[model samples]
Target chain A: WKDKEFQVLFVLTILTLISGTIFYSTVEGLRPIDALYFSVVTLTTVGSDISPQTDFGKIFTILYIFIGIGLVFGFIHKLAVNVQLPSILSNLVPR
Target chain B: DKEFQVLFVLTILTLISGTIFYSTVEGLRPIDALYFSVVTLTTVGSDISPQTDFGKIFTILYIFIGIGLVFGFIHKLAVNVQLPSILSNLV
Candidate 1:
């Protein structure tokens, strides 16, 4: 799965994760750890109890979530193709 | 399994629709259209602007709805695969 599809997905996911983390930390005045944590939680759809403070933050949250879910979709797809599919294929066939 | 297959089909349909939508309305090339839609819906890699005002509106609506459907597909798949593993791990 380390092909064009995988590269696109991987690069996109990484870029969004970094951009979201930086956006939250700078805009929300969050600590680096907290911002990274927020980014991770958002991407995983674990969500957060502490909501964004500003109106911009709220709108940012919407875009952030929109993007985060997409990255997660790619991430999981990569996992499924590389990990799950191979294992399942192995089980379905024999040497 | 049938239910899962349906979700998979819908996901593919949605992706194909997005690719076409971006290409026609946004004037992106086929590969670029597919790439843009994949990155946009997944919110993973990049964002692109549509030229027309209507295109802008459509983009927003598309992003909202697009994200919703794609995420739903993956979410269900994850739950199906992972929940079982986690349960077995608890033993």
Candidate 2:
């Protein structure tokens, strides 16, 4: 059961990354690499200087965070549990 | 569970205090200040950055404390809510 849960979350996290990359690339007119980078940085909440210039892009970013952040958090928690990391170390990390 | 509730309230209080501080010290409007607080705490920093030196310095402290509070609350919420079960429905 734990394994199944982990697999689902892993897939979902990847899907979230892919979806963000695709959206930014098409909507924001960013290069694929930049789009992927922005997606990762944003989702990880380790943001960089790059930001959405367009109004549509900004709005999308806001919505993206509202939804995607939780999924990312869920996946990280599941990953930690699956790995059986020390509780102290697990608590020290943030998503 | 009690700790979860405490962290949740702390997160909200942190945002409110940060918002008030930025609005007053940085001279940003309340809405923009609140937005800035959220953006910084979440570490999803956008183009809107603090211009004032004090604001910038305060933000450094805010980020350190706020991120831990916010992330801790979310982590606890995930466990209590069984987020995987909720997420599994989407698949």
TM-scores of the candidates in the order shown: 0.46, 0.63
Question: Which pairs clash in the backbone of model 2?
Answer: none
Q: Which ten residues in a row have the lowest lDDT in candidate 2 chain A?
A: A62-71
Q: After superposition, which runs of candidate 2 have C-alpha atoms over 4 Å from their true positions?
A: A31-33, A54-63, A66-70, A73-95, B1-9, B27-32, B46-49, B80-91
Candidate 2: C-alpha lDDT: 0.76
The docking quality of candidate 1, as DockQ, is 0.03
What tens-digit string does per-residue lDDT give for candidate 1 at A1-95?
Answer: 44555555566677777887898889999987788888877676665556566667655765566545655666678878877899999999967
TM-score of chain B of 1: 0.72
Error of 1 at B58 (Å): 27
Error of 1 at A32 (Å): 1.4
Model 2 lDDT per residue over B1-91, tens place = 6897898789779979987998999897776666677777766885777788988889988888788787676567656555556466546
Q: lDDT of model 2 at residue A4?
A: 70
